[PDB]
Each structure stands twice: as structure tokens, then as C-alpha cells.
CSV table of C-alpha atoms and ligand atoms in Angstrom, one decimal:
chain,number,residue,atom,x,y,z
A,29,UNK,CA,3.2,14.2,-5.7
A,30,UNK,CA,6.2,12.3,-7.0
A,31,UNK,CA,8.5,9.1,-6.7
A,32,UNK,CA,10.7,10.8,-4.5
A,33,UNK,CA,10.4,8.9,-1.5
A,34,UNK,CA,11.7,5.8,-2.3
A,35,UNK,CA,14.9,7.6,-3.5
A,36,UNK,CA,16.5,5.8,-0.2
A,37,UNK,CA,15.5,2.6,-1.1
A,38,UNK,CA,16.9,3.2,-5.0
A,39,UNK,CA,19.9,4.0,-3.0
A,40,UNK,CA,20.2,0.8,-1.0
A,41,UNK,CA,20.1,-1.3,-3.9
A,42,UNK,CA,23.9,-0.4,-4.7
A,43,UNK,CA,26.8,-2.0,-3.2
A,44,UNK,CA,28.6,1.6,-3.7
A,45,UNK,CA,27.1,5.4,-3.0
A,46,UNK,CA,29.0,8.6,-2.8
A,47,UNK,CA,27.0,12.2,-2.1
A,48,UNK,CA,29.3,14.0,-5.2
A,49,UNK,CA,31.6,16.7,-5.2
A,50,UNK,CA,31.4,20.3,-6.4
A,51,UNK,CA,28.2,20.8,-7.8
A,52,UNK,CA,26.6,19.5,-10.9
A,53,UNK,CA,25.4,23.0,-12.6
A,54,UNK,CA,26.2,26.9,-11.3
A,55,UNK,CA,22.6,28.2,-9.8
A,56,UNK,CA,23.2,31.6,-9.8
A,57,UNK,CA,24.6,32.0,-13.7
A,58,UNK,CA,21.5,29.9,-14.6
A,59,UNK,CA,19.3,30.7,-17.5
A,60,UNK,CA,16.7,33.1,-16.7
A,61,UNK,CA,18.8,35.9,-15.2
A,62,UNK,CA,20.9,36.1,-11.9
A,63,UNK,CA,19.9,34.0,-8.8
A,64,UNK,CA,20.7,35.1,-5.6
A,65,UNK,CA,20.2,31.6,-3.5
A,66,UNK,CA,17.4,31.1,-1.1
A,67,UNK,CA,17.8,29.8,2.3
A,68,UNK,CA,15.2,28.8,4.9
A,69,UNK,CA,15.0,28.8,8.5
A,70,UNK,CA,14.4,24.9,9.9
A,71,UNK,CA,16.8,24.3,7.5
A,72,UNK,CA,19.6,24.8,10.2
A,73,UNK,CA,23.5,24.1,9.4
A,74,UNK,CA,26.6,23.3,11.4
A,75,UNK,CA,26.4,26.7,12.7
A,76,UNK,CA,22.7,27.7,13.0
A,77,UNK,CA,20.4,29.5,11.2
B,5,UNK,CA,20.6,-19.4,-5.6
B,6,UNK,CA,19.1,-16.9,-3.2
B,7,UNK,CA,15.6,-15.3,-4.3
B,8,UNK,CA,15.4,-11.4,-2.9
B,9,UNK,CA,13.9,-8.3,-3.8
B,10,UNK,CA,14.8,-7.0,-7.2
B,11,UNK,CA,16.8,-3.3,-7.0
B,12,UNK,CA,14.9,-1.7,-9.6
B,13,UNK,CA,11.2,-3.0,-8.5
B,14,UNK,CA,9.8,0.5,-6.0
B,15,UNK,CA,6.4,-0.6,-4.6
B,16,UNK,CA,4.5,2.0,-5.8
B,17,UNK,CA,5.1,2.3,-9.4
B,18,UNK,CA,5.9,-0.5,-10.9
B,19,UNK,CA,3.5,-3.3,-8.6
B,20,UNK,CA,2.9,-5.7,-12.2
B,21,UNK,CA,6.5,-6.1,-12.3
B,22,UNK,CA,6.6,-6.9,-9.4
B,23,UNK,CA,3.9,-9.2,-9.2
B,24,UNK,CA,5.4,-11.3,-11.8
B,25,UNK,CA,8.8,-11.2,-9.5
B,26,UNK,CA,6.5,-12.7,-6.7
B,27,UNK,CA,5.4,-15.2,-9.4
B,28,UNK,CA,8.9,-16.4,-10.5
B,29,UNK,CA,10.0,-16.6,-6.5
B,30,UNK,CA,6.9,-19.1,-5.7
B,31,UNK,CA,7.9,-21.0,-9.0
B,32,UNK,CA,11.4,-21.8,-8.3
B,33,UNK,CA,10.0,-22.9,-5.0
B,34,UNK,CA,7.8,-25.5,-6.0
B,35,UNK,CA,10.2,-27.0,-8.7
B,36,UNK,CA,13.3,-27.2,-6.8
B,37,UNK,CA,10.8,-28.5,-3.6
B,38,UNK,CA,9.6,-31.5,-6.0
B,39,UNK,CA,13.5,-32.2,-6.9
B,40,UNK,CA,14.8,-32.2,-3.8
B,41,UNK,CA,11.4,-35.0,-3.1
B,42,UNK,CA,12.7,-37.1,-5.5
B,43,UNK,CA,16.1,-37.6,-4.5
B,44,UNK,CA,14.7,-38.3,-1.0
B,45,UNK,CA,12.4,-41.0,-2.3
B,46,UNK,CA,15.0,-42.5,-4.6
B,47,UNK,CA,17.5,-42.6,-1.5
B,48,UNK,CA,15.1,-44.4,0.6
B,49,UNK,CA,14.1,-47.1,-1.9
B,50,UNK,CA,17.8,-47.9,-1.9
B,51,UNK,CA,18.2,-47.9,1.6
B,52,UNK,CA,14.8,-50.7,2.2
B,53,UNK,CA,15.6,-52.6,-0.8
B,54,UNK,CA,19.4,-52.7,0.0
B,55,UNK,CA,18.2,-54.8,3.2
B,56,UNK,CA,20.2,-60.2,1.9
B,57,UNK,CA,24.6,-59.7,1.0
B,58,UNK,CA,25.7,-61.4,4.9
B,59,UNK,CA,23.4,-64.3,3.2
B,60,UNK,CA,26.3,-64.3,0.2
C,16,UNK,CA,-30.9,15.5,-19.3
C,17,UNK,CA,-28.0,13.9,-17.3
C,18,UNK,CA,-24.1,12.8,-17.1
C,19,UNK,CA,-21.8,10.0,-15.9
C,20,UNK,CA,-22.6,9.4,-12.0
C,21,UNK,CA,-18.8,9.0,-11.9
C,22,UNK,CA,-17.6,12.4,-12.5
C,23,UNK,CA,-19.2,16.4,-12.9
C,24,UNK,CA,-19.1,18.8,-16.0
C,25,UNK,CA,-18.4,21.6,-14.8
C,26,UNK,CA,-19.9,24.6,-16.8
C,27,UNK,CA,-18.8,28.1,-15.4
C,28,UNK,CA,-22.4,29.6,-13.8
C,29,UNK,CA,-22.9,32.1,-15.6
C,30,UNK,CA,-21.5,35.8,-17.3
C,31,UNK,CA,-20.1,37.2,-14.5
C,32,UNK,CA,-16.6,36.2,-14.2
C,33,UNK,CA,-16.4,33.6,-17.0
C,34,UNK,CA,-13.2,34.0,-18.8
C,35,UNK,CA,-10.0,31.6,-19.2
C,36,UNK,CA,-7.8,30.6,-16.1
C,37,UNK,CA,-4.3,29.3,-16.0
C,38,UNK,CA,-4.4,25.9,-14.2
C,39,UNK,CA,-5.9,25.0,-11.1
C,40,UNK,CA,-5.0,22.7,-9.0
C,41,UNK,CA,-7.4,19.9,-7.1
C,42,UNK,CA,-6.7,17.2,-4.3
C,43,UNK,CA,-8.5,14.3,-4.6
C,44,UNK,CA,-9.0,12.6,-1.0
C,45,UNK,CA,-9.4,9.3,0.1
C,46,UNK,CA,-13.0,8.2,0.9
C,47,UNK,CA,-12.7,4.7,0.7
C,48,UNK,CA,-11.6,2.4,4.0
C,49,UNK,CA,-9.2,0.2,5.4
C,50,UNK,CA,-7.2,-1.8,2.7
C,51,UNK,CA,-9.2,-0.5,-0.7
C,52,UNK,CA,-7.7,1.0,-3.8
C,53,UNK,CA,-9.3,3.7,-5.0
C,54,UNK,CA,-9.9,4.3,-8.6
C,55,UNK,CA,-11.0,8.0,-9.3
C,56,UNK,CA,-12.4,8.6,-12.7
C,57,UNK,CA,-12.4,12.1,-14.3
C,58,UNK,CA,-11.9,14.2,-17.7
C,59,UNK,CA,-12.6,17.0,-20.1
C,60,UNK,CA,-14.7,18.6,-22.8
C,61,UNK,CA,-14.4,20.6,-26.2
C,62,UNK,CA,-16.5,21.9,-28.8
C,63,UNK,CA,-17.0,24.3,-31.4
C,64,UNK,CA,-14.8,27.1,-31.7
C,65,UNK,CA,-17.7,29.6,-31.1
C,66,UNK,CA,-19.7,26.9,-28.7
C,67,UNK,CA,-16.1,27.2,-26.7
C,68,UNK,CA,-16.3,30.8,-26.1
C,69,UNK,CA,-20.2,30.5,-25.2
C,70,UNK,CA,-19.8,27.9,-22.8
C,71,UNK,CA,-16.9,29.0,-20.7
C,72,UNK,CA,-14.4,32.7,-21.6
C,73,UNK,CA,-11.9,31.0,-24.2
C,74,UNK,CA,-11.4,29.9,-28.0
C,75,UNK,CA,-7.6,28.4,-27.3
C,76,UNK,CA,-7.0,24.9,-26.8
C,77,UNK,CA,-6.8,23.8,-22.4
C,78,UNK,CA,-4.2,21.5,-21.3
C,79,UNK,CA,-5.0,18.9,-18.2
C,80,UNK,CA,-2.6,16.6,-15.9
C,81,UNK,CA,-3.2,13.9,-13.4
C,82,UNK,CA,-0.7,13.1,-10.6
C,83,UNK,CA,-1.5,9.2,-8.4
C,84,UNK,CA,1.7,7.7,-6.5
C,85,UNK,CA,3.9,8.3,-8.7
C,86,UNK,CA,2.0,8.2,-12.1
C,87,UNK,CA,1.6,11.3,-13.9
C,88,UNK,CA,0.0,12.3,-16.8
C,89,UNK,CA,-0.8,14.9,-19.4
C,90,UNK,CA,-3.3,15.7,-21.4
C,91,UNK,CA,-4.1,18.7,-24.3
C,92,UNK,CA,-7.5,19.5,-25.9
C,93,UNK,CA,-8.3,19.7,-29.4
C,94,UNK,CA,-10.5,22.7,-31.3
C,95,UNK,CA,-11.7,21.8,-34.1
C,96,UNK,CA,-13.5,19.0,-36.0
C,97,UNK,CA,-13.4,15.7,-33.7
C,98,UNK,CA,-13.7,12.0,-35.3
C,99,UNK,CA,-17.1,10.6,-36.3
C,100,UNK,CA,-19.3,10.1,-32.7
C,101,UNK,CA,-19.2,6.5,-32.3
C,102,UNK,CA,-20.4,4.0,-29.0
C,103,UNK,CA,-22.5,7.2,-27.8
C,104,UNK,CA,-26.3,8.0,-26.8
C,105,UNK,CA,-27.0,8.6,-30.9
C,106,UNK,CA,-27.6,12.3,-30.6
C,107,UNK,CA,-25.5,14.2,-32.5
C,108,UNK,CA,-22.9,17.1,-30.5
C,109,UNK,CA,-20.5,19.3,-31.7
C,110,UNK,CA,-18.0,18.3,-28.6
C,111,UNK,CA,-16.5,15.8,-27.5
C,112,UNK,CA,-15.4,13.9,-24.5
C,113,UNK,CA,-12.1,12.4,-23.1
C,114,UNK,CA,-12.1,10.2,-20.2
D,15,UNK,CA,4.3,36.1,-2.2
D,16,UNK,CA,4.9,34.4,-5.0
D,17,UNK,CA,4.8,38.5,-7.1
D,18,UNK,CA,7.1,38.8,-4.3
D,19,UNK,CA,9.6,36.4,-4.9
D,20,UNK,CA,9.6,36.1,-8.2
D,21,UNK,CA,7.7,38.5,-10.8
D,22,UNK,CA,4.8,35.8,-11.6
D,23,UNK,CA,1.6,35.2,-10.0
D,24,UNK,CA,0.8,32.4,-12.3
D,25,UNK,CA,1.6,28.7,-11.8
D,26,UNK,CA,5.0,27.8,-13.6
D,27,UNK,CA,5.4,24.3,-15.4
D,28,UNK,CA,8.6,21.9,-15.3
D,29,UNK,CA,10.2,18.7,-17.1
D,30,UNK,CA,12.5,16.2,-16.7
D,31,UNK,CA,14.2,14.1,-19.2
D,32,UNK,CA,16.9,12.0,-18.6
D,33,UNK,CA,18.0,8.7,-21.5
D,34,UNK,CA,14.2,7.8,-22.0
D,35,UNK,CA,12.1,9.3,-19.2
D,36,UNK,CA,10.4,12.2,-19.3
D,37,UNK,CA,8.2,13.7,-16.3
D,38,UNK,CA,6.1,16.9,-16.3
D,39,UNK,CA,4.9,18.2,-13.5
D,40,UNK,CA,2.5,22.1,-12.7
D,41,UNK,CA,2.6,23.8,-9.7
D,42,UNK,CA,0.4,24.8,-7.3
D,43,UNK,CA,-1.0,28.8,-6.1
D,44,UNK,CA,-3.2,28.3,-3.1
D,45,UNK,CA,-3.2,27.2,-0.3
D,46,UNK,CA,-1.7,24.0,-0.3
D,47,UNK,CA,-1.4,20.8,2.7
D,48,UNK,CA,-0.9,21.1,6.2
D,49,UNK,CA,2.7,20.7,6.8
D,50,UNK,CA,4.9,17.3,7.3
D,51,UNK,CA,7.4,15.7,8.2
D,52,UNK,CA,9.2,18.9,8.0
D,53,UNK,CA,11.9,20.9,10.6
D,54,UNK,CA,8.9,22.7,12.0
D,55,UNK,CA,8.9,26.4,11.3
D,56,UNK,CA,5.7,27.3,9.7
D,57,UNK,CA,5.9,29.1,6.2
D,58,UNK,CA,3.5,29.8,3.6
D,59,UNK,CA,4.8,27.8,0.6
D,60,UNK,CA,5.7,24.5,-0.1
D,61,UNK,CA,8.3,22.5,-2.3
D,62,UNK,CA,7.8,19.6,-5.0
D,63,UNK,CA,11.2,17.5,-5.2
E,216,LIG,C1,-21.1,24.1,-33.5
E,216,LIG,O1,-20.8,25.3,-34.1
E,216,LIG,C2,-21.7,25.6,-35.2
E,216,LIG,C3,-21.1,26.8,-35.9
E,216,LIG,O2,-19.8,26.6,-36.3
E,216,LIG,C4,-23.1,25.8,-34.7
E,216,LIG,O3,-23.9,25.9,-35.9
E,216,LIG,C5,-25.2,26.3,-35.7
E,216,LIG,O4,-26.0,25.1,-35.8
E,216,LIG,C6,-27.4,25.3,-35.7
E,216,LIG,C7,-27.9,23.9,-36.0
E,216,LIG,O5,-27.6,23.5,-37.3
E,216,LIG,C8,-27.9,26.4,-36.6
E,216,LIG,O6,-29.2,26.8,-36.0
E,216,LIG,C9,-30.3,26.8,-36.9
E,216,LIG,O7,-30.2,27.9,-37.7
E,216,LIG,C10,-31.3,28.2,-38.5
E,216,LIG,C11,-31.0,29.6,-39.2
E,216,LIG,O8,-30.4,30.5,-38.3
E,216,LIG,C12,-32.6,28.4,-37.7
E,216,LIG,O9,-33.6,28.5,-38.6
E,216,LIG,C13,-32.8,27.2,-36.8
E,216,LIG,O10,-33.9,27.4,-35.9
E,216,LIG,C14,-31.5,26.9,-36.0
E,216,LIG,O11,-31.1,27.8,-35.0
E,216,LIG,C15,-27.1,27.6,-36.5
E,216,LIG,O12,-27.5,28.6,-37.4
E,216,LIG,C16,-25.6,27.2,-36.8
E,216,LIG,N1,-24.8,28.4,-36.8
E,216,LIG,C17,-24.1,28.8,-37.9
E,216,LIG,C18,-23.0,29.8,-37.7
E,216,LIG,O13,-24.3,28.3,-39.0
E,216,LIG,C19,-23.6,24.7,-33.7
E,216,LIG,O14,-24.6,25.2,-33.0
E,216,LIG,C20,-22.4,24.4,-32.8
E,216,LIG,N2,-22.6,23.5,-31.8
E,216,LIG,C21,-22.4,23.7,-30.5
E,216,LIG,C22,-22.8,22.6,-29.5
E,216,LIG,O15,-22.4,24.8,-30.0
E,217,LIG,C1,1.4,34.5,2.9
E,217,LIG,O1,0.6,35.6,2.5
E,217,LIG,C2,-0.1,36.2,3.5
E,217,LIG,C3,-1.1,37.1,2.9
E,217,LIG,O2,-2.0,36.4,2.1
E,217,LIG,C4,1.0,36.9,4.4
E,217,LIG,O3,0.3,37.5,5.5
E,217,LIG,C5,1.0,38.4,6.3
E,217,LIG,O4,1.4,37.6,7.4
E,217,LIG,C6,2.1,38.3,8.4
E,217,LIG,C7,2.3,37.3,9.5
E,217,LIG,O5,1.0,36.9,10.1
E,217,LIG,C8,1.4,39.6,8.8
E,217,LIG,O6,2.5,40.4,9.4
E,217,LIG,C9,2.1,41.0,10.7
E,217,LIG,O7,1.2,42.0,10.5
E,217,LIG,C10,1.0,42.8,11.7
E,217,LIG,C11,0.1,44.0,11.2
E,217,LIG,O8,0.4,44.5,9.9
E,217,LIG,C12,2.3,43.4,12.2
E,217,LIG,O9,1.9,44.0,13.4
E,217,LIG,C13,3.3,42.3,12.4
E,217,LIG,O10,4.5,42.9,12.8
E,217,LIG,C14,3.4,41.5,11.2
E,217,LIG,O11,4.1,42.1,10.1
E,217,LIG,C15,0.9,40.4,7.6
E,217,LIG,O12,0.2,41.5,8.0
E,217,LIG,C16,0.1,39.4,6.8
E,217,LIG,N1,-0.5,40.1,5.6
E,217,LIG,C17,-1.8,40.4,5.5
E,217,LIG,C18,-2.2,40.7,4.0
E,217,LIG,O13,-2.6,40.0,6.3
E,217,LIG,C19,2.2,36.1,4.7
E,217,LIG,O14,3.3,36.9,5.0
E,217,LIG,C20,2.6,35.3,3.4
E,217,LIG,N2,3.7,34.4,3.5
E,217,LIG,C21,4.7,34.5,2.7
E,217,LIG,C22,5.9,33.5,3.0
E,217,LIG,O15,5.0,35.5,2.0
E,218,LIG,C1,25.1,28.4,8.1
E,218,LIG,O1,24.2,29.5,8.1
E,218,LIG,C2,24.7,30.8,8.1
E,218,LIG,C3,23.5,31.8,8.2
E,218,LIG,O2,22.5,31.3,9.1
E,218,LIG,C4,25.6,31.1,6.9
E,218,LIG,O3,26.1,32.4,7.0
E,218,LIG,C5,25.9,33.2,5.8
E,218,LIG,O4,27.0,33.1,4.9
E,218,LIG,C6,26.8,33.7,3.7
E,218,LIG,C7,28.0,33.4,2.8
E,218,LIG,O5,28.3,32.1,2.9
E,218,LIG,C8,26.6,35.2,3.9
E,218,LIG,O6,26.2,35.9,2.7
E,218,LIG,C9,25.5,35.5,4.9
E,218,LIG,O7,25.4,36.9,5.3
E,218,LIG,C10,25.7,34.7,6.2
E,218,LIG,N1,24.7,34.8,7.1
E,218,LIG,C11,24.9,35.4,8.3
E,218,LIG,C12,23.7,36.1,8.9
E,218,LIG,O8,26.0,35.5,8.8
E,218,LIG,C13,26.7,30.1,6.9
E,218,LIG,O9,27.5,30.2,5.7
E,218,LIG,C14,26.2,28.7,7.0
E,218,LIG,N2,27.3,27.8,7.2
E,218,LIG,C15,27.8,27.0,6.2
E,218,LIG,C16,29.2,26.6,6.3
E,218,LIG,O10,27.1,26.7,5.2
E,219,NAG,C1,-18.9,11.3,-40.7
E,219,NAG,O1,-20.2,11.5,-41.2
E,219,NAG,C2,-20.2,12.0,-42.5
E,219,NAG,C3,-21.7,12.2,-42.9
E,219,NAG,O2,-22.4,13.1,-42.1
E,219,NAG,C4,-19.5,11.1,-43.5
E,219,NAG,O3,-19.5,11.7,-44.7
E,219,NAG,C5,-18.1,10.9,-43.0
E,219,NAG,O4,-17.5,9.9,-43.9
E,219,NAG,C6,-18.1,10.4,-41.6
E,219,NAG,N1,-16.7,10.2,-41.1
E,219,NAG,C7,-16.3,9.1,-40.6
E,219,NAG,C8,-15.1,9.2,-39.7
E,219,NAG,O5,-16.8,8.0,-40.9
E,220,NAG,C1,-4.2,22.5,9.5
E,220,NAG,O1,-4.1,23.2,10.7
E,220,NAG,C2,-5.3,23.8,11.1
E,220,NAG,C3,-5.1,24.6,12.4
E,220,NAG,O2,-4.1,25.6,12.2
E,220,NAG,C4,-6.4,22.8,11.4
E,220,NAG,O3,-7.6,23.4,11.7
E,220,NAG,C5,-6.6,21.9,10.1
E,220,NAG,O4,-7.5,20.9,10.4
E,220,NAG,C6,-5.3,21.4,9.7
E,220,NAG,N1,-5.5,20.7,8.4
E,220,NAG,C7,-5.1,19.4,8.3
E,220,NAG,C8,-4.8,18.9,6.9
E,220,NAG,O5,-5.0,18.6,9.2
């Protein structure tokens, strides 16, 4: 329902990519009130869960 | 010079673009295929017509 | 009295629970085989201001979008007076019709 | 769920614009695809990305 998978194939056309650092925009002092940040099982991290 | 996918291109939008990419690739082919022809022919007409000087 | 074969105009039954919706959303499968591109046609209707509230629940204007590989689009209706009928069957509507 | 979550049954519209390019996309209520490709925990909802 969108473009995004050829996002990896965008990618490849650059001689140079970098994840970033930090984080482009604070999530939970968006607009619209405060966010407490949702998290998912089967999306497992270093640790678990 | 080489001929390969263009960066921007993405299969699945922009397929007229890219069309016209698959145009210019079988283009260049042709042309430079004809050149290269022609300096073949011309080396070889040298070569049989060169063939007369020991008689000098 | 008929309509396109290509697509379905779809008038909601009947009193009951006719009234305005925010959107609703439709897949649009396959159907075709092997190596074929499918081209799907489909669109909308509006009328009268009053004709609009007898047809289906709502006077306000309804808004539309399309989403194929990548290509999206969006669409928003218009209420009142359309442009002259022109190309059509020569009998004369108060709607309209965008494909 | 979605009254749940947040405090909207309703579906809730977004747009991108970046130098140019402008997207609009609508989201989606019921039920929606059979899951894919994803970690495989089932859940009720889906994401657009
Ligand atoms: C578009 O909306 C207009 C109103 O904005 C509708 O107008 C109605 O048009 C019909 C046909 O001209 C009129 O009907 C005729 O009325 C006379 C007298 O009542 C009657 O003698 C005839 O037998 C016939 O019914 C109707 O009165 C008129 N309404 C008004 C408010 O003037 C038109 O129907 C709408 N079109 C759509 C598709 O709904
Ligand atoms: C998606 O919405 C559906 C309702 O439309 C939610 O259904 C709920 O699903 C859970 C899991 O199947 C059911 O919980 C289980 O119920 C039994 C009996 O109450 C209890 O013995 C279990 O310990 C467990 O809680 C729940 O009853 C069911 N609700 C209804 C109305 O049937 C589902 O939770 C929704 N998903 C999201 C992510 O919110
Ligand atoms: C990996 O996941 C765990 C949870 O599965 C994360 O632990 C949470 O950390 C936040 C603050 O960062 C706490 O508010 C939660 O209470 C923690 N969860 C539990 C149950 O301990 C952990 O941070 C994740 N690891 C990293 C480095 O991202
Ligand atoms: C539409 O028709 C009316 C006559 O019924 C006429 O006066 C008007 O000029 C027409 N409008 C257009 C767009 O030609
Ligand atoms: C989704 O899963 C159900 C079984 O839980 C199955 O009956 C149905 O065919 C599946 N739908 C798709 C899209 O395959």
C-alpha cells in the first residue's frame, strides 16, 4: 500500500549509507499530547521481549 | 562507457522512464556496434590491398 | 435502465440505516492470470443538494482515494451546479459522474 | 481496540511532503490481510510504513 519496499534498492544506489544518530524528532513531546511509546512482542531486542 | 541500471529508476513506479532507459541502452548498442564494423572493414581493405612493394 | 458493465453504483438499499459514513476501505483482488496487467476502472457520483440527501444520508461534500503499486490518488466531490452535460446519453440529470 | 488505544473509532488520515512530493494516505478499521512476512506473533492490527 506504498513504495516502501524498494527502500533497499533506493539505498543500494549510494556509494555511502549511515543509519543516523539520535533521533530526528522527540515522540513523546509530539503534537497531540503526551506519547507513551508502543512496543510489540515479535519485535524482539538484544535482550528479549 | 558502461550502460547499467539508473539509481533513481524503482520498477514499480516509474516503468516509462524506464522504458525510455531500455531504449537509450539498445541505442548506443547499435551505433557504437556499426562503428566498431567500420573500422574492421576499413582495416581489412588495407590489409588485401596492401598485398606488390618486394616487386619495387 | 442500465450502467457501465465496468463498474457498480452503489445506491444505499433503502431507509433503514442510510446515513453518511467516514471512509471505507476496499481491496481490489487480482482476477486476471499469469503475466496480465490489470486495469480496474471505478468512481463516484453527486447531485443535487436535496437529491444527495434522498439518495444516500448526507448533504456535505465525500472525498475518495485510490491506492495501485505505489500510485495514489485523491479525489473530492462537488455539491452544487456541475458544467454543461456534454458526450453523454442526451438525457438531462442533475448529477454527475467522475471516472 | 482502536477506542482502546487511542480515543477514536474512526479512520485517521496522514500526509507527507518533503521539497516537491506530497503523499496522502487513509487508514483502514476492519479486518484487514492475513499476515506477512512478519516475526510471527499474531495481533489484530496492522501497520502502513
Ligand atoms: C435537482 O434538484 C432540484 C431542486 O433543487 C429538483 O427539482 C425538481 O425538479 C422537478 C422537475 O423539474 C420538479 O418536478 C415537477 O414539479 C411540478 C410541480 O411540483 C409537477 O407538476 C411535476 O409533475 C414535477 O414533479 C420539482 O418540483 C423540482 N423541485 C423543486 C424544489 O423545484 C430536481 O428533481 C433534482 N434532481 C435530482 C436528480 O434529484
Ligand atoms: C481484536 O478485537 C477482538 C474483539 O473484536 C478482541 O477479542 C478478544 O480476544 C481475546 C483473545 O481471543 C479474548 O480474551 C479471552 O477471553 C476469554 C473469555 O473472556 C478469557 O477466558 C481469556 O483469558 C481471554 O481474555 C476476548 O474475550 C476477545 N473479546 C471478545 C469481545 O470476544 C481482541 O482482543 C482484539 N485485539 C486487539 C489487539 O485489541
Ligand atoms: C529490550 O526489551 C526490554 C523489554 O522487553 C526493554 O526493557 C524495558 O525498558 C524500559 C525502559 O527502557 C522500561 O520502561 C520497561 O519496564 C522495560 N521492560 C521490562 C519488562 O523490563 C529493554 O529496554 C530493551 N532493550 C533495549 C536496550 O532496547
Ligand atoms: C448550459 O445550458 C444553458 C441553457 O439551458 C445555457 O444557458 C448555458 O450557457 C449552458 N452552459 C454552458 C457551459 O454552455
Ligand atoms: C487467513 O487465515 C485463515 C485461518 O485462520 C484462513 O482461513 C484464511 O484463508 C486466511 N486468509 C488468507 C488471506 O489466506
Amino acid at each position: 500500500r506504498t513504495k516502501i519496499r524498494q527502500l533497499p534498492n533506493l539505498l543500494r544506489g549510494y556509494e555511502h549509507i549511515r543509519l543516523s544518530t539520535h533521533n530526528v524528532i522527540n515522540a513523546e513531546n509530539a503534537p497531540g499530547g503526551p506519547y507513551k511509546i508502543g512496543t510489540s512482542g515479535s519485535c524482539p531486542n538484544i535482550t528479549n521481549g | 562507457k558502461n550502460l547499467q541500471r539508473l539509481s533513481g529508476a524503482m520498477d514499480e513506479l516509474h516503468n516509462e522512464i524506464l522504458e525510455l532507459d531500455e531504449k537509450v541502452d539498445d541505442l548506443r548498442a547499435d551505433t557504437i556496434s556499426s562503428q566498431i564494423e567500420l573500422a574492421v572493414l576499413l582495416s581489412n581493405e588495407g590489409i588485401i590491398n596492401s598485398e606488390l612493394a618486394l616487386e619495387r | 435502465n442500465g450502467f457501465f458493465a465496468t463498474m457498480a453504483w452503489a445506491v444505499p438499499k433503502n431507509d433503514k440505516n442510510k446515513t453518511a459514513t467516514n471512509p471505507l476501505t476496499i481491496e481490489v483482488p487480482y482476477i486476471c492470470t499469469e503475466g496480465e496487467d490489470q486495469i480496474t476502472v471505478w468512481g463516484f457520483h453527486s447531485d443535487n443538494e436535496t437529491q444527495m440527501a434522498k439518495l444516500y444520508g448526507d448533504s456535505k461534500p465525500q472525498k475518495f482515494t485510490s491506492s495501485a503499486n505505489g500510485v495514489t490518488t485523491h479525489y473530492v466531490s462537488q455539491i452544487g451546479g456541475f458544467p454543461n452535460q456534454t458526450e453523454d446519453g442526451g438525457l438531462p440529470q442533475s448529477g454527475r459522474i467522475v471516472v
